[PDB]
Amino acid sequence: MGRYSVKRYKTKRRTRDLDLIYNDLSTKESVQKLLNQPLDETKPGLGQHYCIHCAKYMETAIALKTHLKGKVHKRRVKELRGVPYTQEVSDAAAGYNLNKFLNRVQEITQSVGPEKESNEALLKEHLDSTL
Amino acid sequence: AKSLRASSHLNAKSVKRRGVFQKAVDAREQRISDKLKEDLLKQKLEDLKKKE
Amino acid sequence: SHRKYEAPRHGHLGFLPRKRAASIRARVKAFPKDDRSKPVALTSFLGYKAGMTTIVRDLDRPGSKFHKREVVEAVTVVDTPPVVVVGVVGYVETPRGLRSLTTVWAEHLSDEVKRRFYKNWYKSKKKAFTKYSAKYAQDGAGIERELARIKKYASVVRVLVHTQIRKTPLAQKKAHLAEIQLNGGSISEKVDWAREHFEKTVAVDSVFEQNEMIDAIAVTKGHGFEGVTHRWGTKKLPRKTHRGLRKVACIGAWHPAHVMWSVARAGQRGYHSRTSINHKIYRVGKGDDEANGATSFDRTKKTITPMGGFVHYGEIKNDFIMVKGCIPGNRKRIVTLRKSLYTNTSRKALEEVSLKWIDTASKFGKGRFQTPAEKHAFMGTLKKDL
Amino acid sequence: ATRTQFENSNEIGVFSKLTNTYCLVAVGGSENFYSAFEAELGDAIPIVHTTIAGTRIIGRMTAGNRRGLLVPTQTTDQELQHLRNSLPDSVKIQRVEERLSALGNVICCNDYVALVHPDIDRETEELISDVLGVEVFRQTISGNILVGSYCSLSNQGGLVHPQTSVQDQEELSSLLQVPLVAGTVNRGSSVVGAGMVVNDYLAVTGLDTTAPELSVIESIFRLQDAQPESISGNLRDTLIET
Amino acid sequence: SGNGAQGTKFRISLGLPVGAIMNCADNSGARNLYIIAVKGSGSRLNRLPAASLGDMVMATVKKGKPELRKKVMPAIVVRQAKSWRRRDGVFLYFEDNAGVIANPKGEMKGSAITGPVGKECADLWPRVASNSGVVV
Amino acid sequence: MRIYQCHFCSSPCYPGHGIMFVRNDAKEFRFCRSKCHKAFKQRRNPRKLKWTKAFRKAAGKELAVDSTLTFAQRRNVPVRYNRELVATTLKAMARIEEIR
RNA sequence: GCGUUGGAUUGUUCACCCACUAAUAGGGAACGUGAGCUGGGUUUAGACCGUCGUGAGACAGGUUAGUUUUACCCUACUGAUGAAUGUUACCGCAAUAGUAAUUGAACUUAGUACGAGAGGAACAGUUCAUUCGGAUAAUUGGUUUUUGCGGCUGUCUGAUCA
RNA sequence: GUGAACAGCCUCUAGUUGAUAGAAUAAUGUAGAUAAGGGAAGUCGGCAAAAUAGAUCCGUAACUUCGGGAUAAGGAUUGGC
């Protein structure tokens, strides 16, 4: 309706979203798939220098050092902390599928949580060494 | 294709009115005329209450 | 030249002239013929339109690609209180037309139809039929004459009726008169039917029933003096043309040196009288019947009146006709429902519907609850409750 | 070995599902396609007019054998209720939620061994083995990604599309434990799973399917009662030309 | 409708007009498609022939294999991103525009289709329904 | 008919209300109304918006864990329709609402 | 009676190609159409080139830049009132004038009729769409001075509040 | 006061409250805006409008009279306490 929301938030100009980015950090395979992508000509960094949290390609390796030291990227780290808000959070609020929802909160607290927190802890060690 | 007022379809449509689709109307005009006879009998019963 | 590019005409020349109609109740131009063996049957009925709502339906249509599947669509709800007979008119066939020759009135009339005959009710001494009701003395003896004129003469018989505007939440107090023909055979049986209904009210289900194709006529939505571009559909001139862009550029040629009658000028839009045919009745509910909105599926006691009622209208606590599509006219206006004018041929005019869910969420905003019991269940409790 | 045409399409496995103990048909238009199943099957098994998510393509949305029937997520509650009313209690009917909806392209199976798409999740792979009572193997036919569209099975034998290498056939028959032939149906369609339906005693295919192609199909599924499939060597004379 | 299209095509909203670059979904070897014309279209002064979900449109490849490029060939739309109407009570829209290239019979060219194919297209073209990994 | 809730609003969405979005990952996002739909386009967070129900179950408002809130789950086996099951579920749903 | 298009190069009509479609039929109305437009072209003054001329200058050879005025009048046409028929009020009749619907597919009939061969119909029954028309606002979308609610920047009321 | 600034916006001293007004919100206007999907298919022609913009840091091509080209292109960031 306004001017500014139509500029950034059309359907054409949409980012990935907060659901799929949590699944990428959930395992060790897709961490190493997205870091070590094959070079592609259409993509901005020629298929290199990609941040996993902010799904965004960086041009130069110097453009990661300035990106990781900033309030934009610290924002997306804090955004991905809790349970990633699937559809099941919306239906459990109405009084519908608790045990489907209660098992997911149980697994993410026990199993997937500290495995994701280990995978992010190795990204900060990996991007430190290459840069 | 054939237009709305062509002689072929209007001869074809006249047979269907002789058949099924007039029977449903003649069934309809008997059920509605039954309730209109029961419209007087309910409204004459309320007139009997004031006769009391 | 030769126009270089053919294009269909803008506007329909059948509906000329576009002008304001004579009254807010459109007169009916033609009636279904006469099936003179059938019982006596009122041809039409008149009620008040009230809003719109959505209906889902399991479509029982053989041959379609939506056979045995669910279909959502929009319907209109016309408030239809019972209508009471007050008069009988006969028409003699002439070689000039149909000339009326006799009215007969019904010995005592309600306060509403006397209000139709004045424009200043509060000043008048209300002397409307006072010298006429005295003519129902010892045996009447004039009314028996004027009835027997219709029995002898008068090839067709129409029945004066009026509505019950005091029962409608619409605040206007003045009923509308109407003429409705009868289709029973043997005009003595036409006129002896109507003599037995003086001061007597006719319901809605006694004129229509479900799955019937009807047509509604009304006066459609005055918009005032409106320019050509939205009135006829003329294309806009591109941008910053000298003297306007919402108009017709070329209006004629050098011969004939007169503006033609068909060149899309500017003027009135809306408030015309229209006839739209083949509208299908889904539901004939009753005012005394609680749980009108409950289908065979829903099993929830609720009336079709949405939360906070219809917008710009009261409550449907009366008989109603749910019909699909969109009747011309707006809310709180008077429509007239004729019946079909000919036997309809297609399979669509034969199918029996079964409504699966009626919407009753509020139309004053984004309605998200059917009943107020749902909302207080879903919200929880509030500060003002305890 | 019956030729049958849905409205004017030679595709049958798209529009119908056929196992050993039931059959599923679409509802479009008129009962010509439904009658041809009553010509062959009789009253011995239930045949069900059904829709899946309000569609007509019910052979590519569902997947199953004589033990079970799997419907995707978008199957509505009425249509899931309608399947259990018709089919008896010996069949299990269970709605499955996934990423990918079309189970017919993804799961090809017999009564005994199933094959799945590689990207299918292991939380369904457990459910497939539990409902259908079969084994599950993750494999691709000739590097083509959809094992249900490009392969058709029964307990009798199996048929694959002609891009399958001969090395690929010998490896894959050890998994399915049935003989395998590269073939075409409906005059050279590569999509051999969608073109035909087959169970252990009946094959129904399109009208465009030629008489050399019926000879291959009647052989490998052994449709006559005294066929040991070795008559394909006797039917090799059709194969060299066609 | 026309040739190859089984059944009738109901009314859905017109999303892709002439000159619309849309993604190429299959594994044929192209990246994007450029609509130049819509088969089964009308004829009215100054209208643009607009495609919809599940129509066979002629489309040239702008970016892809040079073998596929510089020749006109049919294409079937599978994703729309304009809000259209299903006849049960919902309006839905996809994320982007997409099309797969085809012969005039209505047969597919590649083996796979990535992303969801529309339900209105999947009833209409059976060969698209054969290669559809994900429906809806 | 499947009275599904808003993805953002957790409010019931009757047939003919709101928009659905379909992701490339092919899960459905059926929305309550245009208010909730434009909040999802702008990438806002329903844990932080105070008027939604996902906030209230999380932030110590209206109770989350209950015995009556477990009855409504889902069923993926279609139990073949005896009447006397259905006649008691009408007594069941009337009672669970009285207790909730 | 009813339709007859979307684009590319040119100021150009004309011309030809690409593509859809049932088809892309031909012409008139001051070679329709400027107080309807456009100024692209043509038609003044400035200026460069080529030819001609001793020279002023010529060329409608080529190329650049160039003031577009008025309707409130009568009439036509689209709309809107109204004196005069005893008054005023309601319900009607129909003279005349206008007129509107249009094409393409699909299931079934049928892979049947037909064939020295492959190939390959229609009428009856039924479902949808294309162009046009008339309406309507349930729903979805668009619009916001309800400045309805909330937020933000600079400043001003001593600060909070407003 | 904000800010690079005698910019723009708001205020203090000083000055003015003058420019025919009242009621309603039809068409067409003049002035100023927003618009779903597609993005020049419009047109003599991207005319107009939209987009970009201040600032710190990284980075900058063909060519060149070696002075330039250059803010070339392109990329990260900006509040509060």
From Swiss-Prot, chain A:
One GO biological process term: ribosomal large subunit export from nucleus
Key word Ribosomal protein present: no
Main location: nucleus
CC terms in the record's Gene Ontology section: cytoplasm; nucleus; preribosome, large subunit precursor
Keywords noted in UniProt: Cytoplasm, Metal-binding, Nucleus, Ribosome biogenesis, Zinc, Zinc-finger
Renumbered residue ranges of the record's region Nuclear export signal-like (NES-like): 17-31
Molecular-function GO terms, alphabetical: nucleic acid binding; ribosomal large subunit binding; zinc ion binding
Positions of short motif Nuclear localization signal: 7-16
Subunit comment: Associates with pre-60S ribosomal particles; released from the pre-60S particle very early in the cytoplasm.
Note: Present with 5630 molecules/cell in log phase SD medium.
Family to which the UniProt record says this protein belongs: Belongs to the ZNF593/BUD20 C2H2-type zinc-finger protein family.
Protein name: Bud site selection protein 20
Species this protein is from: Saccharomyces cerevisiae (strain ATCC 204508 / S288c) (Baker's yeast)
UniProtKB/Swiss-Prot annotation, chain C:
UniProt modified residues of type Phosphothreonine: 102
Disruption phenotype: A mutant confers resistance to trichodermin, a trichotecene toxin produced by plant-pathogenic fungi.
InterPro entries: L3_arc_euk, Ribosomal_L3_dom_3_arc_sf, Ribosomal_uL3, Ribosomal_uL3_CS, Transl_B-barrel_sf
Any Pfam family matching the protein: Ribosomal_L3
Residues that bear Phosphoserine: 23, 155, 296
Keyword Ubl conjugation: yes
Glycyl lysine isopeptide (Lys-Gly) (interchain with G-Cter in ubiquitin) cross-link, renumbered residues: 38, 135
GO biological process: cytoplasmic translation; maintenance of translational fidelity; ribosomal large subunit assembly; rRNA processing; translation; translational elongation
Residue positions, PTM Pros-methylhistidine: 242
Cell compartment(s), UniProt: Cytoplasm
Matching PROSITE patterns: RIBOSOMAL_L3 (PS00474)
An example Gene Ontology molecular-function term: structural constituent of ribosome
PTM summary: Methylation at His-242 by HPM1 is required for proper 60S subunit assembly and promotes translational elongation fidelity.
Alphabetical keyword list: Cytoplasm, Isopeptide bond, Methylation, Phosphoprotein, Ribonucleoprotein, Ribosomal protein, Ubl conjugation
Keyword Lipid metabolism in record: no
GO cellular component: cytoplasm; cytosol; cytosolic large ribosomal subunit
Domain of life, source organism: Eukaryota
Family affiliation: Belongs to the universal ribosomal protein uL3 family.
Further facts: Present with 450 molecules/cell in log phase SD medium.
Protein name: Large ribosomal subunit protein uL3
Organism per entry: Saccharomyces cerevisiae (strain ATCC 204508 / S288c) (Baker's yeast)
Name of the gene encoding the protein in the UniProt record: RPL3
UniProtKB/Swiss-Prot annotation, chain D:
Keyword Nucleus among UniProt keywords: yes
PTM comment, free text: Phosphorylation at Ser-173 and Ser-174 promotes nuclear export.
GO BP of this protein: assembly of large subunit precursor of preribosome; cytosolic ribosome assembly; maturation of 5.8S rRNA; maturation of 5.8S rRNA from tricistronic rRNA transcript (SSU-rRNA, 5.8S rRNA, LSU-rRNA); maturation of LSU-rRNA; maturation of LSU-rRNA from tricistronic rRNA transcript (SSU-rRNA, 5.8S rRNA, LSU-rRNA); ribosomal large subunit biogenesis; ribosomal subunit export from nucleus
SUPFAM superfamilies on file: Pentein (SSF55909)
Pfam families: eIF-6
Keyword Phosphoprotein assigned: yes
GO cellular-component term (any): cytoplasm
Molecular function terms, GO-annotated: ribosomal large subunit binding; translation initiation factor activity
Phosphoserine carried by residues: 173-174, 230
Predominant location: cytoplasm
Places the protein is found: Cytoplasm; Nucleus, Nucleolus
Keyword terms, alphabetized: Cytoplasm, Initiation factor, Nucleus, Phosphoprotein, Protein biosynthesis, Ribosome biogenesis
Classification via Gene3D superfamilies: L-arginine/glycine Amidinotransferase, Chain A
Coiled coil: none
Similarity field: Belongs to the eIF-6 family.
PANTHER family named among the record's database cross-references: TRANSLATION INITIATION FACTOR 6 (PTHR10784)
Further facts: Present with 18600 molecules/cell in log phase SD medium.
Subunit architecture: Monomer. Associates with the 60S ribosomal subunit.
Identification of the protein by name: Eukaryotic translation initiation factor 6
Originating organism: Saccharomyces cerevisiae (strain ATCC 204508 / S288c)
Gene name in the database record: TIF6
UniProtKB/Swiss-Prot annotation, chain E:
Residues with PTM N-acetylserine: 1
One Gene Ontology CC term in the entry: cytosolic large ribosomal subunit
Keywords: Acetylation, Cytoplasm, Methylation, Ribonucleoprotein, Ribosomal protein
Record-level GO BP terms: cytoplasmic translation
Modification note: Methylated by RKM1 at 2 different sites, but it is unclear which are the 2 methylated residues among Lys-39, Lys-105 and/or Lys-109.
Entry GO MF terms: large ribosomal subunit rRNA binding; structural constituent of ribosome
N6,N6-dimethyllysine modifications at: 105, 109
CDD domains from the UniProt entry: Ribosomal_uL14
Keyword presence, Acetylation: yes
Superkingdom of the organism of origin: Eukaryota
Pfam family, one: Ribosomal_L14
InterPro entries linked to this entry: Ribosomal_uL14, Ribosomal_uL14_CS, Ribosomal_uL14_sf
Function description: Component of the ribosome, a large ribonucleoprotein complex responsible for the synthesis of proteins in the cell. The small ribosomal subunit (SSU) binds messenger RNAs (mRNAs) and translates the encoded message by selecting cognate aminoacyl-transfer RNA (tRNA) molecules. The large subunit (LSU) contains the ribosomal catalytic site termed the peptidyl transferase center (PTC), which catalyzes the formation of peptide bonds, thereby polymerizing the amino acids delivered by tRNAs into a polypeptide chain.
Protein family membership: Belongs to the universal ribosomal protein uL14 family.
The protein's name: Large ribosomal subunit protein uL14A
Gene name tied to this protein: RPL23A
